[PDB]
Amino acid sequence: INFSALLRGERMCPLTREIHSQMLIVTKSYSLVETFRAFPRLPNILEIGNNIVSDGNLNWGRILILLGISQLYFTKSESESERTQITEQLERFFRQDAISNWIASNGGWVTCASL
């Protein structure tokens, strides 16, 4: 996935476009919006991702929710540096072997998109 394409909704391939469509739905979650509104200062997305899996579990609902909060911060971002930081931290989270190996073993991004 090109996370810059995803968060900008720009020059998306079909898979990224479908994940983008799912993201959008997710960004309407009341609990997600409330969580976002409670922390307007942009946090470290890589750390958030690693904290989510700190119980030893991962699933596609968690992944979609992490992308969703990332999109919310990206939409409200106040500088290009903030957008670069979001994109790079998402890229770094999903490029960790522990996460990339889970995705590859659980249907790949195509399985996320086929939901």
Partner: peptide, 24 residues
Amino acid sequence: ALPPEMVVARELRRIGDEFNRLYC
């Protein structure tokens, strides 16, 4: 006091699992 990343993550795990159960 607590890192925001820890507070946010706790909530997102809970929401993510509920989304996983209902829709995934």
